[PDB]
Amino acid sequence: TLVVYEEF
Amino acid sequence: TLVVYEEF
Amino acid sequence: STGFPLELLTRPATERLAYFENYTVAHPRLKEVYEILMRTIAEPAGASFIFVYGASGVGKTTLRLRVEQKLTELALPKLESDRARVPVVGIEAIAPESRYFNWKEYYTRALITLEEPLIDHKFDYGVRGISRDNFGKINVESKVVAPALRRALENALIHRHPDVFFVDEAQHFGKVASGYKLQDQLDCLKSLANMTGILHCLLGTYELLTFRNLSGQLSRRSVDIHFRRYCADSPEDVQAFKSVLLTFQQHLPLAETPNLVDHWEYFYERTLGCIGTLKDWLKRVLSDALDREATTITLKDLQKRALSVAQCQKMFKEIQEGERQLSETEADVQNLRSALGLG
Amino acid sequence: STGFPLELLTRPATERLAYFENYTVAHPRLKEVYEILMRTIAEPAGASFIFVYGASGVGKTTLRLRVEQKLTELALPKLESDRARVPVVGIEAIAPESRYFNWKEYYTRALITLEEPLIDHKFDYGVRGISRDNFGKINVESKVVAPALRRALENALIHRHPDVFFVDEAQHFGKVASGYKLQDQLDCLKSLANMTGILHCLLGTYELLTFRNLSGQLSRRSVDIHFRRYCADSPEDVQAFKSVLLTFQQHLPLAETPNLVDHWEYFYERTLGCIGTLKDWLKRVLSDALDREATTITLKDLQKRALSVAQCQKMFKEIQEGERQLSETEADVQNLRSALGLG
Amino acid sequence: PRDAFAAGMAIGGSRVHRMIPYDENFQILTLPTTSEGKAKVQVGRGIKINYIYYWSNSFRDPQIENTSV
Numbered sequence: 130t131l132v133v134y135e136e137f
Numbered sequence: 138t139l140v141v142y143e144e145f
Numbered sequence: 146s147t148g149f150p151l152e153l154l155t156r157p158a159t160e161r162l163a164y165f166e167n168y169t170v171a172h173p174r175l176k177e178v179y180e181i182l183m184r185t186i187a188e189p190a191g192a193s194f195i196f197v198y199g200a201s202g203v204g205k206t207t208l209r210l211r212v213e214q215k216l217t218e219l220a221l222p223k224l225e226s227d228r229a230r231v232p233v234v235g236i237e238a239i240a241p242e243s244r245y246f247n248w249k250e251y252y253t254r255a256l257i258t259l260e261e262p263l264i265d266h267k268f269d270y271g272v273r274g275i276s277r278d279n280f281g282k283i284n285v286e287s288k289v290v291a292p293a294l295r296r297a298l299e300n301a302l303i304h305r306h307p308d309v310f311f312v313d314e315a316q317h318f319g320k321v322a323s324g325y326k327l328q329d330q331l332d333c334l335k336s337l338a339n340m341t342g343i344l345h346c347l348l349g350t351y352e353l354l355t356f357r358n359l360s361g362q363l364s365r366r367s368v369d370i371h372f373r374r375y376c377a378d379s380p381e382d383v384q385a386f387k388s389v390l391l392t393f394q395q396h397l398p399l400a401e402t403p404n405l406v407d408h409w410e411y412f413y414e415r416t417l418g419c420i421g422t423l424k425d426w427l428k429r430v431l432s433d434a435l436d437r438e439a440t441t442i443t444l445k446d447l448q449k450r451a452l453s454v455a456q457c458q459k460m461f462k463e464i465q466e467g468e469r470q471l472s473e474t475e476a477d478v479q480n481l482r483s484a485l486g487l488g
Numbered sequence: 489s490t491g492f493p494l495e496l497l498t499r500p501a502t503e504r505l506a507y508f509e510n511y512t513v514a515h516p517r518l519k520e521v522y523e524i525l526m527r528t529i530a531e532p533a534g535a536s537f538i539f540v541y542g543a544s545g546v547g548k549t550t551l552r553l554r555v556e557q558k559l560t561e562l563a564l565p566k567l568e569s570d571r572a573r574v575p576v577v578g579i580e581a582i583a584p585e586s587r588y589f590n591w592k593e594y595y596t597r598a599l600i601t602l603e604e605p606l607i608d609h610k611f612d613y614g615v616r617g618i619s620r621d622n623f624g625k626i627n628v629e630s631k632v633v634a635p636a637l638r639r640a641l642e643n644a645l646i647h648r649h650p651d652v653f654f655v656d657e658a659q660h661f662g663k664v665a666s667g668y669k670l671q672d673q674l675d676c677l678k679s680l681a682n683m684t685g686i687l688h689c690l691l692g693t694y695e696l697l698t699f700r701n702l703s704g705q706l707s708r709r710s711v712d713i714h715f716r717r718y719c720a721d722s723p724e725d726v727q728a729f730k731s732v733l734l735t736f737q738q739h740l741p742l743a744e745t746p747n748l749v750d751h752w753e754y755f756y757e758r759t760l761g762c763i764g765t766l767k768d769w770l771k772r773v774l775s776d777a778l779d780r781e782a783t784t785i786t787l788k789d790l791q792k793r794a795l796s797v798a799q800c801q802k803m804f805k806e807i808q809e810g811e812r813q814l815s816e817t818e819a820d821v822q823n824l825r826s827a828l829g830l831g
Numbered sequence: 832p833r834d835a836f837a838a839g840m841a842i843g844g845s846r847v848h849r850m851i852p853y854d855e856n857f858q859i860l861t862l863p864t865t866s867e868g869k870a871k872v873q874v875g876r877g878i879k880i881n882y883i884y885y886w887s888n889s890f891r892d893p894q895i896e897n898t899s900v
């Protein structure tokens with residue numbers, strides 16, 4: 130499983 | 138016995 | 146949404162490139178150093194320096210322009226009632242043109258950058274040769290001696306009352322003359338930071354690794370932040386690298402999404418786990434593709450913009466040099482306990 | 489009672505943090521040091537220097553602050569009638585940005601900090617280039633050479649006669665060139681102090697030990713004080729560390745009091761027995777708790793805000809090299825007796 | 832040989848004055864040196880012996896700095 134991050 | 142100090 | 150906006154496909158190439166430019170990822174290292182840095186600026190308890198070591202490409206500069214903007218937003222409600230205050234101050238150290246670093250230029254740059262407020266503020270310095278002109282630009286007479294410039298700087302920093310003074314390219318301080326002590330420079334910085342009451346956050350590469358724990362006073366009043374490149378040995382770092390690669394590939398504005406995760410070993414080889422270098426590579430490839438107006442990014446456009454092998458050899462040499470220094474080991478804790486009469 | 493008042497239970501985080509930060513404890517080491525410093529200040533009896541050696545973070549500056557505060561009530565009733573007199577003055581040495589120390593800057597800073605009692609008082613320093621502007625800020629010209637500034641400072645110090653001249657961070661006097669000797673710098677300071685008849689108290693780390701016992705004059709002329717830490721090799725220091733931890737625990741403004749007595753060992757690992765370092769760590773962890781909104785304190789927040797291993801290593805190395813030179817043994821007493829012939 | 836040694840040093844005297852005590856002084860006296868005999872104390876680096884640099888605490892004193900020892 131590959132996690133998805135958000136903008137910073 | 139544990140001592141309790143005052144404020145400088 | 147979780148991908149790049151659809152309307153970007155409708156817009157011309159420059160808009161897609163600009164959107165790629167303004168996209169900043171949030172990897173666990175970045176958020177961890179974000180939390181640590183926010184906490185230490187909010188509460189230093191006497192510490193005067195904040196060292197942030199890192200590679201060439203992990204996001205130091207960025208790290209700040211984010212911390213600068215966030216602290217500005219935080220202080221805006223505090224600036225709503227208290228005036229003549231600057232939230233943060235940030236300058237970049239200038240590499241000298243001669244064998245020795247220039248402190249006069251440093252003080253001049255700091256006084257120029259810090260003092261660009263609304264003209265209504267009319268704070269007066271202690272030096273006649275430094276003057277705010279009618280146009281609003283601070284002019285420093287070339288004859289003003291350094292100590293002079295520094296007195297001023299201290300007066301301005303104690304009147305403005307900021308929370309942190311950022312200095313990029315801190316290793317440029319190390320361009321001393323042959324025989325000049327590398328502790329006297331940190332001593333000058335500490336003297337500046339000890340009476341103004343402003344934290345000094347030094348940002349630099351592993352060369353700044355030559356400015357650590359020189360003295361007990363320079364050690365107790367120092368906070369060491371390290372910003373590590375992603376390591377292939379750690380499985381969780383591998384998962385994080387794959388996740389950031391997938392995120393960058395997904396937000397890569399194009400009609401077709403090539404599988405950048407598949408070439409993860411090539412990416413690691415040509416970026417050394419440094420996300421900034423990965424973003425530079427992706428930017429070059431995207432510019433190439435959008436010039437050719439194609440929708441698919443191949444390995445050929447990845448190679449025609451790829452860094453040379455000797456470059457990666459040199460950066461990895463530097464990174465190993467840096468990472469050997471700040472290693473922590475249980476043996477260190479136990480021998481420090483033993484030498485203290487604690488074991 | 490023995491801890492913080494219960495009213496502080498209904499306030500914001502800022503009030504609790506301010507109360508804790510403005511809280512200074514009186515450990516027996518600090519009590520003895522304060523008593524002997526006060527007695528020395530009352531009657532130096534021909535003493536020109538009071539060097540204050542100690543580990544970085546032991547409590548030198550807070551002791552100096554309390555000393556000036558005390559001097560301000562032993563004077564205020566006598567300052568209602570008398571005037572043109574200050575109880576105590578202070579200054580911190582500037583670390584030079586050049587290879588050599590700037591004595592002219594020291595003189596200018598001392599004259600600036602000494603002479604601001606009231607605009608009504610006027611006195612001619614006898615040096616052309618020193619005045620008071622419309623804003624009440626003592627200004628000195630850039631061309632007043634060091635001897636003229638020294639004469640002006642001498643006249644001002646004779647006129648003002650403070651009970652002591654505090655020079656904090658005195659080790660910065662040692663920033664000299666190849667041929668320059670430390671005895672010359674200390675002799676200039678001694679000449680100033682003796683000519684103005686004002687006792688000088690130099691405070692700093694163990695680097696100031698390079699200014700100890702240089703010549704027979706600089707030597708007689710001196711009451712050396714030592715702000716020693718608490719050492720784990722003696723039961724009394726360990727018990728006092730535990731007791732100060734208990735009083736800190738009872739004076740941490742939290743609904744539930746954490747148990748810091750059992751965790752003293754790791755404490756002493758990262759604090760080296762220095763109460764100032766312990767206080768900064770405790771205030772940092774309290775700010776963390778009040779930001780996270782945690783009722784009590786756990787070990788994880790203590791390990792998120794403790795010092796690094798290498799920092800404590802260098803600190804303890806400096807502390808060892810310091811205490812090695814400030815110990816009295818009967819062997820030295822008998823050696824001096826035999827050399828004199830008293831034995 | 833031990834008997835001859837003892838008899839000779841009894842007849843010819845022990846000559847305690849010419850005794851060399853095996854202590855630290857003799858330890859540093861037996862040690863060799865370079866061709867010049869002395870080296871300069873460069874500020875922040877120390878003394879250059881056999882391609883390497885050596886530093887000591889006392890070298891921080893400017894009296895012996897930039898001089899031959």
Ligand SMILES: Nc1ncnc2c1ncn2[C@@H]1O[C@H](COP(=O)(O)OP(=O)(O)OP(=O)(O)O)[C@@H](O)[C@H]1O
Nearest residue numbers: 168169170171200201202203204205206207421424
């Ligand atoms: N977390 C991130 N997400 C997206 N882009 C990033 C991130 N961190 C760094 N970058 C990109 O890295 C590029 C160059 O690196 P950056 O400006 O962050 O400095 P740095 O590599 O830390 O510093 P230096 O080159 O001085 O060692 C910038 O274009 C920036 O957008």
Ligand SMILES: Nc1ncnc2c1ncn2[C@@H]1O[C@H](COP(=O)(O)OP(=O)(O)OP(=O)(O)O)[C@@H](O)[C@H]1O
Nearest residue numbers: 191511512513544545546547548549550763764767
């Ligand atoms: N007895 C004490 N009780 C409470 N806080 C203390 C005490 N002693 C020191 N502190 C706190 O420790 C912090 C730093 O200590 P301090 O300013 O006294 O340093 P110092 O011993 O003069 O060291 P340095 O040479 O590194 O400047 C301050 O926040 C100060 O309030």
Ligand SMILES: [Mg+2]
Nearest residue numbers: 205206207313
């Ligand atoms: Mg940068």
Ligand SMILES: [Mg+2]
Nearest residue numbers: 548549656657
């Ligand atoms: Mg101090």
